Amino acid sequence: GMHVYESDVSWIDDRRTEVSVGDHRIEVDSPPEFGGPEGQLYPETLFPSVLASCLLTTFLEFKDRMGINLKSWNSHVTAELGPSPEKGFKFHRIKIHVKIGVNDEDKEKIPRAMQLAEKYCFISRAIRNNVEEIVDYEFV
Protein backbone atom coordinates (compact mmCIF):
# COMPACT_ATOMS: atom_id res chain seq x y z
CA GLY A 1 0.00 0.00 0.00
CA MET A 2 3.09 2.28 -0.12
CA HIS A 3 2.80 5.07 -2.67
CA VAL A 4 5.89 4.64 -4.84
CA TYR A 5 7.65 7.59 -6.45
CA GLU A 6 10.33 7.02 -9.10
CA SER A 7 13.08 9.03 -10.70
CA ASP A 8 16.43 8.66 -12.42
CA VAL A 9 19.82 10.29 -11.88
CA SER A 10 22.84 10.08 -14.19
CA TRP A 11 26.36 11.37 -14.51
CA ILE A 12 26.78 13.94 -17.32
CA ASP A 13 30.55 14.44 -16.97
CA ASP A 14 33.03 16.13 -14.59
CA ARG A 15 31.11 16.91 -11.33
CA ARG A 16 27.73 17.23 -13.05
CA THR A 17 24.54 15.13 -12.62
CA GLU A 18 21.18 15.00 -14.38
CA VAL A 19 17.95 14.49 -12.46
CA SER A 20 15.07 13.07 -14.56
CA VAL A 21 11.57 13.12 -13.11
CA GLY A 22 8.76 12.59 -15.58
CA ASP A 23 9.38 15.09 -18.34
CA HIS A 24 11.49 17.44 -16.20
CA ARG A 25 15.29 17.36 -16.35
CA ILE A 26 17.42 19.27 -13.87
CA GLU A 27 21.20 19.67 -13.79
CA VAL A 28 22.42 19.22 -10.20
CA ASP A 29 26.14 19.54 -9.64
CA SER A 30 28.86 19.53 -7.05
CA PRO A 31 29.30 23.05 -5.70
CA PRO A 32 32.45 25.10 -6.17
CA GLU A 33 33.80 24.30 -2.70
CA PHE A 34 34.07 20.65 -3.79
CA GLY A 35 35.34 21.38 -7.32
CA GLY A 36 32.10 21.97 -9.21
CA PRO A 37 30.91 24.79 -11.43
CA GLU A 38 29.54 28.13 -10.37
CA GLY A 39 25.96 29.15 -11.20
CA GLN A 40 24.21 25.78 -10.98
CA LEU A 41 21.87 23.94 -8.65
CA TYR A 42 23.65 21.85 -6.06
CA PRO A 43 22.41 19.28 -3.55
CA GLU A 44 23.46 21.78 -0.92
CA THR A 45 20.83 24.30 -2.08
CA LEU A 46 18.23 21.95 -3.54
CA PHE A 47 17.80 19.72 -0.48
CA PRO A 48 17.17 22.58 1.98
CA SER A 49 14.84 24.21 -0.58
CA VAL A 50 12.80 21.02 -0.93
CA LEU A 51 12.64 20.81 2.82
CA ALA A 52 11.18 24.36 2.83
CA SER A 53 8.75 23.44 0.01
CA CYS A 54 7.50 20.38 1.98
CA LEU A 55 7.15 22.49 5.15
CA LEU A 56 5.02 24.97 3.23
CA THR A 57 2.82 22.30 1.56
CA THR A 58 2.27 20.64 4.99
CA PHE A 59 1.40 24.04 6.45
CA LEU A 60 -1.14 24.59 3.64
CA GLU A 61 -3.04 21.48 4.78
CA PHE A 62 -3.28 22.84 8.31
CA LYS A 63 -4.10 26.35 6.99
CA ASP A 64 -7.21 24.90 5.21
CA ARG A 65 -8.08 22.72 8.15
CA MET A 66 -7.94 25.61 10.64
CA GLY A 67 -9.71 28.17 8.45
CA ILE A 68 -6.69 30.48 8.15
CA ASN A 69 -6.97 33.04 5.37
CA LEU A 70 -3.41 32.93 4.01
CA LYS A 71 -2.49 35.95 1.88
CA SER A 72 1.20 35.27 1.21
CA TRP A 73 4.13 33.11 2.27
CA ASN A 74 7.73 33.80 1.43
CA SER A 75 10.58 31.97 3.09
CA HIS A 76 14.34 32.41 3.13
CA VAL A 77 16.41 29.26 3.58
CA THR A 78 19.92 29.28 5.14
CA ALA A 79 21.76 25.91 5.22
CA GLU A 80 25.16 25.43 6.94
CA LEU A 81 27.39 22.58 5.78
CA GLY A 82 30.37 21.82 8.03
CA PRO A 83 32.74 19.18 9.40
CA SER A 84 31.33 15.98 10.93
CA PRO A 85 33.01 14.24 13.83
CA GLU A 86 32.66 11.11 11.63
CA LYS A 87 34.98 12.89 9.19
CA GLY A 88 33.78 14.50 6.03
CA PHE A 89 30.81 16.86 6.20
CA LYS A 90 27.22 17.17 7.28
CA PHE A 91 24.50 19.76 7.38
CA HIS A 92 24.83 21.39 10.76
CA ARG A 93 21.79 23.62 10.68
CA ILE A 94 19.05 24.57 8.22
CA LYS A 95 17.21 27.79 9.07
CA ILE A 96 13.88 28.65 7.40
CA HIS A 97 12.62 32.19 8.01
CA VAL A 98 9.04 32.73 6.89
CA LYS A 99 7.25 36.01 6.19
CA ILE A 100 3.55 35.21 6.53
CA GLY A 101 0.64 37.43 5.46
CA VAL A 102 -2.61 36.39 7.15
CA ASN A 103 -5.75 38.11 8.45
CA ASP A 104 -5.27 39.52 11.96
CA GLU A 105 -8.01 37.25 13.30
CA ASP A 106 -5.99 34.19 12.20
CA LYS A 107 -2.66 35.15 13.89
CA GLU A 108 -3.57 33.34 17.13
CA LYS A 109 -3.78 30.04 15.18
CA ILE A 110 -0.33 30.32 13.62
CA PRO A 111 1.86 28.97 16.46
CA ARG A 112 -0.13 25.72 16.41
CA ALA A 113 -0.27 25.57 12.62
CA MET A 114 3.47 26.10 12.32
CA GLN A 115 4.32 23.56 14.98
CA LEU A 116 2.03 21.01 13.28
CA ALA A 117 3.46 21.73 9.84
CA GLU A 118 7.00 21.08 11.00
CA LYS A 119 5.97 18.01 13.04
CA TYR A 120 4.15 16.33 10.13
CA CYS A 121 6.47 17.48 7.29
CA PHE A 122 7.84 14.37 5.57
CA ILE A 123 11.31 15.88 4.98
CA SER A 124 11.50 17.31 8.52
CA ARG A 125 10.76 13.84 9.81
CA ALA A 126 13.42 12.39 7.49
CA ILE A 127 16.21 14.59 9.02
CA ARG A 128 15.06 14.57 12.60
CA ASN A 129 17.93 14.41 15.16
CA ASN A 130 20.61 14.56 12.42
CA VAL A 131 20.34 18.22 11.32
CA GLU A 132 19.27 21.21 13.45
CA GLU A 133 16.07 22.62 11.88
CA ILE A 134 15.13 26.16 12.96
CA VAL A 135 11.82 27.42 11.61
CA ASP A 136 10.70 30.86 12.64
CA TYR A 137 8.44 33.56 11.16
CA GLU A 138 7.22 37.14 11.18
CA PHE A 139 3.92 38.67 10.06
CA VAL A 140 3.88 41.01 7.16
Ligand X SMILES: CC(C)(COP(=O)(O)OP(=O)(O)OC[C@H]1O[C@@H](n2cnc3c(N)ncnc32)[C@H](O)[C@@H]1OP(=O)(O)O)[C@@H](O)C(=O)NCCC(=O)NCCS
- The correct pick among 37, 75, 118, 137 for binding a second copy (CB under 8 A) is 75
Shortest reach from residue 9's CB to ligand X, in Å: 13
Q: Specify whether the CB–CB gap between 60 and 120 falls below 8 A.
A: no
Q: Can residue 108 be called a binding residue for a second copy (CB under 8 A)?
A: no
Phi, psi of 79 (to 5 degrees): -110, 135
**Closer to ligand X by Cβ: residue 74 or 115:** 115
Spatial neighbors of 28 by CB under 8 A, at least 6 apart, are 17, 18, 19, 40, 41, 42, 43, 46
Q: Can residue 88 be called a binding residue for ligand X (CB under 6 A)?
A: yes
Q: Specify whether the CB–CB gap between 46 and 61 falls below 8 A.
A: no
Query: Rule CB under 6 A: which of 43-72 touch ligand X?
Result: 43, 54, 57-58, 61, 65-66
Q: Which helix (H) or strand (E) holds 43?
A: helix 43-65
Shortest reach from residue 2's CB to a second copy, in Å: 4
The torsion region of residue 38 among left (phi > 0), alpha (psi -120 to 50) and beta comes to beta
Q: How far apart are CA 122 and CA 34, in angstroms?
A: 29
Q: Can residue 31 be called a binding residue for a second copy (CB under 8 A)?
A: yes
List residues forming the annotated binding site. 65, 87-88, 112, 119-120
- Binding residues (CB under 6 A) for ligand X: these are 30, 34, 43, 54, 57-58, 61, 65-66, 87-89, 116, 120
List residues forming the annotated binding site for CoA. 65, 87-88, 112, 119-120
